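Help needed: design a sequence for this.
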């Protein structure tokens, strides 16, 4: 049967996916091959966020679960007031695979605000 749709999508590496996520929150909007791949990130995040948000501008969620990101589970962990790093811990995983990295809270949060505002 035709049940290799997610199996086709998952052909990418979870580390590679993590990297383009990092590249998005640092500088997203290149006009080579960036547009489509990152567009999927924009819409998936924008929708899952506004779905757990009242509308826009309010306190955005601390854990953003994206289990189906290129067949890879990624969990965005926003730091609390007692956290000394003040950075976002991104955790992408894929069965035997696991990858963890940090990005500035300023970058992730401002893009996530602008993403809710981009939806309007």
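Sure. Designed sequence:
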């Amino acid at each position: 049967g035709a049940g290799t749709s997610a199996a086709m999508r998952q052909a990418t590496s979870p580390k590679t996916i993590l990297e383009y996520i990092i590249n998005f929150f640092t500088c997203g909007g290149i006009r080579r091959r960036n547009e489509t791949q990152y567009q999927e990130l924009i819409e998936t995040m924008a929708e899952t966020l506004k779905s757990t948000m009242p509308d826009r501008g309010a306190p955005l969620p601390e854990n953003i679960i994206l289990d189906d990101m290129d067949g890879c589970r990624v969990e965005f962990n926003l730091p609390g007031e007692n956290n000394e790093a003040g950075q976002v811990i991104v955790r992408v995983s894929k069965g035997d695979h696991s990858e963890t990295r940090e990005i500035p809270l300023a970058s992730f949060e401002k893009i996530c605000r602008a993403l809710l505002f981009r939806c309007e």
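The chain has one domain: 1-120.
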